[PDB]
């Protein structure tokens with residue numbers, strides 16, 4: 001599909017009657033350190049990516065009864081849960097996280113995040129990109145579109161989070177490495193990954209039901225959570241609706257992530273521990289995932305201005321999304 005100008009894309013933003021809508025008010029404004037036990041998180045694990053890591057095809061639980069890999073799958077599942085039992089009893093891998101909710105409003109392709117409900121002083125800006133090709137019967141989406149425009153005068157909110165399967169991951173994996181035990185090195189890293197993703201799922205439910213509080217009576221099964229049968233999204237920097245990784249630095253500042261969790265960012269803006277998830281929370285009922293995809297030089301240069309970066313810097317961070325050489 002052919003490219004459009006930045007202005008043409010913005011003229012085709014997500015269309016919504018903000019005058020008739022009351023964005024749900026965040027019940028708990030502020031930043032809260034959290035933790036979750038392995039016992040708590042194991043009921044929020046999505047096991048299917050675990051089997052994928054072990055190069056086995058099929059959806060859990062059906063994979064256990066499969067005819068070619070079911071026996072192997074059952075053995076992997078037993079070893080995994082045996083290791084979860086031990087990590088749990090010995091408290092040797094300890095999931096940690098932090099959550100925050102803030103007053104927020106959209107301005108253009110960005111989301112202003114305010115110190116307080118006066119909505120004057122901006123403590124941070126969450127910057128977003130916009131789809132920039134010809135859209136047939138649909139908006140040129142930008143994640144900012146799911147927050148009320150400041151011009152509408154509607155009180156709106158944004159959340160963020162960072163969670164990890166635990167700071168101990170490297171020590172446990174490295175010890176299996178020193179033992180030449182590649183099986184259990186793979187296993188403990190796969191389990192840390194499951195616990196991080198389970199914590200992201202559990203904490204998102206906590207946010208919808210309690211911290212933000214717009215779905216207090218939600219009652220979804222784990223399978224329904226895996227199918228994303230809830231209202232709102234938790235998009236993560238680096239993923240297709242917000243591919244620009246340096247926005248993780250804004251999450252780290254907003255939530256004081258390292259102070260509250262021990263989690264760190266690298267020079268490439270990768271998270272440490274490896275088993276880590278971070279992202280935003282959007283409440284809007286029409287919010288959804290999509291791909292920004294390829295963008296043009298006008299949007300790159302505008303993003304650079306808004307970020308305080310040179311055009312050269314932004315072309316490094318957005319290299320995979322450049323629709324030009």
Ligand SMILES: Nc1ncnc2c1ncn2[C@@H]1O[C@H](CSCC[C@H](N)C(=O)O)[C@@H](O)[C@H]1O
Pocket residue numbers: 046049197198226234235236237239240241242279289290291
């Ligand atoms: N287009 C997109 N833009 C931003 N984030 C996306 C995205 N598509 C998926 N995600 C992210 O990926 C997560 C889903 S994958 C994680 C849950 C899954 N049950 C598992 O264990 O693997 C989403 O919650 C969101 O954080």
